[PDB]
Curated annotation (Swiss-Prot):
Swiss-Prot/TrEMBL site (Cleaved under oxidative stress) positions: I128, G129
Covered residues, full protein: 1 to 217 of 724
Induction comment from the UniProt entry of this chain: By heat shock.
Binding site for ATP: N48, D90, K109, F135
Protein's UniProt name: Heat shock protein HSP 90-beta
Family the UniProt entry places it in: Belongs to the heat shock protein 90 family.
Species this chain originates from: Homo sapiens
Length: 219
């Protein structure tokens, strides 16, 4: 019948960080400018998943136990019309917390910087992947992006950013993906075409027709 009052927790559960300025500049650039072919975002995500799937499979031959979390190497695409989300799940190698904060918030600095310099000298947005930072093209279509990831050597973590100059990371006790990465795009009001059946088939067939892993569409 008492009333305790927990004045201190084990660890801070929600950490907030600022992107390196160059990453923020590119993100502000992406989320605001016009691009005629915004469908390429899905190509960049599928491209990242192929790489994550490749990396766990390379390690799969030297150590067969690294598929403890799942033996199927696949990509799943789930539009959710009533939540305005599109999610891509892969069972690739995933990311540790250290990698997640570092890769998305910090060491992307060089690629984003070189890419912006490239843009002013006449490159276009579709070259973003040749600068290793294709992930940020998600903001062509999303007002908010969430990344859930699970690496064999770490726990599951959730990353989030609405492109306001900062991102958050927290331990995700939500649904366990056993290994890999889940990207959740909260789409802008005008990009709801990517919640429809035909259009998503159209984009995968147009851009990722030669991926060496199965892509499954869930409606
Ligand atoms: C958020 C964005 C950067 C991203 C990361 C991963 C991901 O964990 N990896 C892991 C890994 C290991 C070696 C090369 C490439 C990669 C990608 C991923 O699988 C996807 C799939 O969409 C993503 O979008």
């Amino acid at each position: 019948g008492h009333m305790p009052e927990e004045v201190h927790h084990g660890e801070e559960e929600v950490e907030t960080f600022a992107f390196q300025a160059e990453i923020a500049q590119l993100m502000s650039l992406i989320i605001n400018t016009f691009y005629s072919n915004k469908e390429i975002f899905l190509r960049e995500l599928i491209s990242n998943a192929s790489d994550a799937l490749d990396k766990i499979r390379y390690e799969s031959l030297t150590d067969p136990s690294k598929l403890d979390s799942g033996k199927e190497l696949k990509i799943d695409i789930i539009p959710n019309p009533q939540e305005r989300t599109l999610t891509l799940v892969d069972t690739g190698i995933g990311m540790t917390k250290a990698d997640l904060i570092n890769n998305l918030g910090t060491i992307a600095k060089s690629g984003t910087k070189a890419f912006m310099e490239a843009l002013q000298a006449g490159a276009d947005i579709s070259m973003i992947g040749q600068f290793g930072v294709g992930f940020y093209s998600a903001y062509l279509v999303a007002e908010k992006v969430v990344v859930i990831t699970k690496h064999n050597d770490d726990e599951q973590y959730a990353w989030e950013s609405s492109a306001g100059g900062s991102f958050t990371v927290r331990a995700d006790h939500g649904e366990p993906i056993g290994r890999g990465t889940k990207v959740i795009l909260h789409l802008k009001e005008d990009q709801t075409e990517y919640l429809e059946e035909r259009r998503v088939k159209e984009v995968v067939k147009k851009h990722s027709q030669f991926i060496g892993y199965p892509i499954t569409l869930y409606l």
